[PDB]
Amino acid sequence: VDYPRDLIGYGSNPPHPHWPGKARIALSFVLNYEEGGERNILHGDKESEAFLSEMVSAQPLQGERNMSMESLYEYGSRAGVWRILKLFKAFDIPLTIFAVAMAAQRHPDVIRAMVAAGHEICSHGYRWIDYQYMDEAQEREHMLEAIRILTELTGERPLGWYTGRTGPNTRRLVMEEGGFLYDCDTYDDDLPYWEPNNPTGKPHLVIPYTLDTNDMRFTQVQGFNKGDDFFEYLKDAFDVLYAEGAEAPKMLSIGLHCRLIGRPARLAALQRFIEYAKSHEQVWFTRRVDIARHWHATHPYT
Amino acid sequence: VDYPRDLIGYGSNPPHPHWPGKARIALSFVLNYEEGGERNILHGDKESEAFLSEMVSAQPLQGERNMSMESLYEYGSRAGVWRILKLFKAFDIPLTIFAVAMAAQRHPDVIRAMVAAGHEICSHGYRWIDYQYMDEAQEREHMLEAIRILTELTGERPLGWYTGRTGPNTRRLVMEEGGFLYDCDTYDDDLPYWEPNNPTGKPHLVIPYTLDTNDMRFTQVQGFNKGDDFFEYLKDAFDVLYAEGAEAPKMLSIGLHCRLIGRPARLAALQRFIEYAKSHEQVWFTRRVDIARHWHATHPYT
Amino acid sequence: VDYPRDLIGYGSNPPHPHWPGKARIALSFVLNYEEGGERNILHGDKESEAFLSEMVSAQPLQGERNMSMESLYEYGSRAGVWRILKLFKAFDIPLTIFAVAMAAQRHPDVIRAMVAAGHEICSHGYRWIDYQYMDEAQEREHMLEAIRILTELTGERPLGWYTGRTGPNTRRLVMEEGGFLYDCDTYDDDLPYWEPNNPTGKPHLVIPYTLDTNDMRFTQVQGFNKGDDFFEYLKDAFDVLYAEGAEAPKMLSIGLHCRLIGRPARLAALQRFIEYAKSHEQVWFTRRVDIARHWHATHPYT
Amino acid sequence: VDYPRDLIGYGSNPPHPHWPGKARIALSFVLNYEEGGERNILHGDKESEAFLSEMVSAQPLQGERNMSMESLYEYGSRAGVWRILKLFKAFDIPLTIFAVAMAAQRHPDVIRAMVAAGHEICSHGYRWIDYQYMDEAQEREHMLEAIRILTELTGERPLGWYTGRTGPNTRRLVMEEGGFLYDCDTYDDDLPYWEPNNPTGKPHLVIPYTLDTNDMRFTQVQGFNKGDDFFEYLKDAFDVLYAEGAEAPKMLSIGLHCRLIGRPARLAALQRFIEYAKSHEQVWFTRRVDIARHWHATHPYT
Ligand SMILES: NC(=O)c1nc[nH]c1N
Numbered sequence A, B, C, D: 001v002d003y004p005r006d007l008i009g010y011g012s013n014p015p016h017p018h019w020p021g022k023a024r025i026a027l028s029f030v031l032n033y034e035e036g037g038e039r040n041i042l043h044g045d046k047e048s049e050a051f052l053s054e055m056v057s058a059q060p061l062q063g064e065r066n067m068s069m070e071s072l073y074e075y076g077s078r079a080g081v082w083r084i085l086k087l088f089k090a091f092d093i094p095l096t097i098f099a100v101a102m103a104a105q106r107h108p109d110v111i112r113a114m115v116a117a118g119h120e121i122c123s124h125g126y127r128w129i130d131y132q133y134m135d136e137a138q139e140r141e142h143m144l145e146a147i148r149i150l151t152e153l154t155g156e157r158p159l160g161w162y163t164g165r166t167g168p169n170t171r172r173l174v175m176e177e178g179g180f181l182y183d184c185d186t187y188d189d190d191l192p193y194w195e196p197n198n199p200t201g202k203p204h205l206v207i208p209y210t211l212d213t214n215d216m217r218f219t220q221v222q223g224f225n226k227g228d229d230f231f232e233y234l235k236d237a238f239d240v241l242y243a244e245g246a247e248a249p250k251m252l253s254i255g256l257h258c259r260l261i262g263r264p265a266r267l268a269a270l271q272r273f274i275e276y277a278k279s280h281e282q283v284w285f286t287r288r289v290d291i292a293r294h295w296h297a298t299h300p301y302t
């Protein structure tokens, strides 16, 4: 008898994080880069992409090419990413980039442009796909293959990972890997915690990510019609955490995608919230690597 | 010739409930607990969970494990439930817990923590699944099995039931069971009524539940984009009942799930409504068991 | 070479209707009654109902019984219909009832209760289903069978029809039938027009209905989250027609369903609009039969 | 090794367009005409239409006729188109018509009526369908067949194209064709650019279109509930571009469909935005052909 799920975690007693600056909230802004990395027969894929694009009802096409799907992704790398990088640089808030190995190759300039802005480049896997079914063998060297590309693309290896479309073996291999300080393949808490089942023994930091305060909802069945739906949602999820942080601060992730929030219609909202957030004192805008290194010092694994 | 459906009920003449305090409305706040109880091959299930999670387009996976799906549920037990329990305790309004036997085992501390707050623990079945197809035999001892777990988990047996994903045999077996005062496997009225087709002869109270003033809509195709959609909906459904209650009071159910409303973004709305509701006199916040025992005394079965 | 579709109609020259009272708009409020008439193995159906219910992602079940689905419909006949009848009687605006033969049997009291309020009872077919595939033979006597039930249910035959889920043969048979003054199985205009392809030769009036200013959208993938979405939509579609009616009045249909708008949450919106509409002079609230008889006198078939 | 996708385009350096009048934004209003051109067994199709109609969950029917689907399209040609033509003529802003060959035949009067208003008639293909799978041979003379119809329908050939539901061969054949100045079968930028892979050698202008600032979203799973969702979206996507245009102007496409925006409920929003847009100086309302000819002179292919 063994349950491979921790349904309880900290329970009624979440640790206090003591965010630098005495912030009542810690905000993680995340910009993915998957454009170019997505499904495509050109990449070897047996079908075209269908996930997160204006084509909200798109289906995959076996041994076909979704020219439309492709164009919409192309907006993310071509136009969307730039516009967002100005927004964040504009307010001096830093980013964590969930960058997919194959996309980074295909647009190394923009990666190096991020790296120079001081944004942290976290690994988003070798390719933007669903690992759920992948064989353990072929999945393990996607990771090391991804680990190699970004080190050579960036100058330093990635000490963070996030697959997203995880298969079971995924979070294990991350931890078995070695050189990662954290992962984000959880949406299970409002705070970071050390992975309880690390075979490796070495401390492993978990920084849960989000599928609700994620701009991906602008293209899902359930999701924002206008910008303001995203914004009101972010304000809400801010207000409630800030209010809690008067005695017990927590964090909040914000997921952005080049092809979605980068569209001017939706960018308006993202800036709206930034300004909102910025108007409150005791807010720590930060990269996830900093949250990991903050945790290490603050609440070292025991 | 026999129609097994009562399409008429009270017709033009709903009974007046005389809610304690002379309230013009009776409000039933319900917090489900299904996290840990849901579909999973670890539980014997042939496929992973797909119902009510941020993964609004998730499909079931035969003999697979949806690590993502699991994590999102894990948020309900780990973080969501606690935050909500503070909200309700915060306003001194009481709850009725629709608790699923298997989840209660997996987190007995939080169940006992509820029981101590004074919230009523109603049965939500042995496992959170779709009974629609289950064989009468194997379904009947899920119930008694569920009936045993919560008595031993709580100190008293459950005198209420709600499966949700009912099969035909379900509401019968509930009534054939014996020790239940009511059930909630109806969404067919704005007031409680005695089950008209109880083979058992013994009075059986029906307290219709809701799939519209339910936070579940935040993850369905049709459903709230921002918090305010839930809230405006609740205000509306409040305003119209309160206005009616000037001469004929009725009730209103509110369905909450740990993994959904417990997310800070959506909690803001839930509190918004509570405050709204609280600002009106002649409102009876109550547990369903109290509504059953209120009915017994007020409008005894004949 | 023959195109069985009139893509042009009145073109740039819609006729002026000269609505009684010199109204700048004519409003058709329609309340369906399908509850009890819907799909069900008890009715002979090979599967349960799945269309328009809170169960926004429900699927049909072959030789099964959706107890949940049924309960939600039961709300329409049990509670929803009554509450709405008060709303409309409350403002003295009259209704056109799209009543399905099988539902009318199952709740004759409420039908006769409508008839006494002075509302017009239009035929909605024998059963609430999809005729698209039905054989011409078995479909033709559904209609006459439906035609018989409501005459005996009401005192007068139905001079109007609307199937909704039409099959090709449907609108023909309506016209071949004989005693109907109009039908509504079109959503193709903002005004009534005589059917251009009536084999019968006898004048046939078309009164297009709506699938957008229909409360059905509260349960479809695309559709209102809160009441206000319905209301804002109705105000818009009112404002634009009223503004046009300064020189060229038109009509507007409003589709309501017992099980959907009758829920207090959504009723609030419906009343909101009524009040809105009521606040403007030169608005003709009317039954469709009156619109037919108005047309006859005003713009007789040539 | 050859990647058939330009993921980078202008990168960090989009060209300045110097819009006539020194406008800080260039607005492309587009009204499609597909009604009559859509899928239908009468047209040879093996199934009925299912894309973009109030029937938001409609499925295609093999060798069948969706009478309902048809009626809803019929609203676009019969009523919707006219009402919109007044709106745009009302404000003196000009249109680009994406007109589908088969629809234009079926309603030549309305086409010639557009042509006389001074609106540009761009080709939207021979038939409104999905070319993705079409054989290169039979697809190539759809285009020339479409090219012939509109020249004879309009007086001048179409120097622009947009299929929408493109297959790979599509944009190639457009360029191989010869007499087109641009195409719009991209959604990959916020500015026009010369096609980088034109086999023909001759300059080919790309004017990316939109699937987000498109009224089509009113009938998709993700999309506007009320008018205001469309409008707020347009204001946002306007505000952000206008703000950028203080130093670097760009354009914005607006997709409209007769059967969707032409409904009074949604027309209100479209006018709302027009007025909004109109209230700002330095806005260039224009046809796409003018944007092509503007580009030619301003930023000639090299
Ligand atoms: N964050 C993401 O875009 C993602 N990565 C894998 N699956 C996803 N949804």
Ligand SMILES: NC(=O)c1nc[nH]c1N
Pocket (backbone or CB within 6 Å): B032, B034, B129, B163, B164, B165, B166, B255
């Ligand atoms: N209330 C519930 O979460 C539920 N229980 C069974 N099916 C459901 N939707």
Ligand SMILES: NC(=O)c1nc[nH]c1N
Pocket (backbone or CB within 6 Å): C032, C034, C129, C163, C164, C165, C166, C255
């Ligand atoms: N109006 C209706 O509810 C209807 N009737 C047949 N199909 C429908 N959608």
Ligand SMILES: NC(=O)c1nc[nH]c1N
Pocket (backbone or CB within 6 Å): D032, D034, D129, D163, D164, D165, D166, D255
């Ligand atoms: N713009 C359009 O309506 C379109 N044309 C082809 N596919 C589409 N969605």
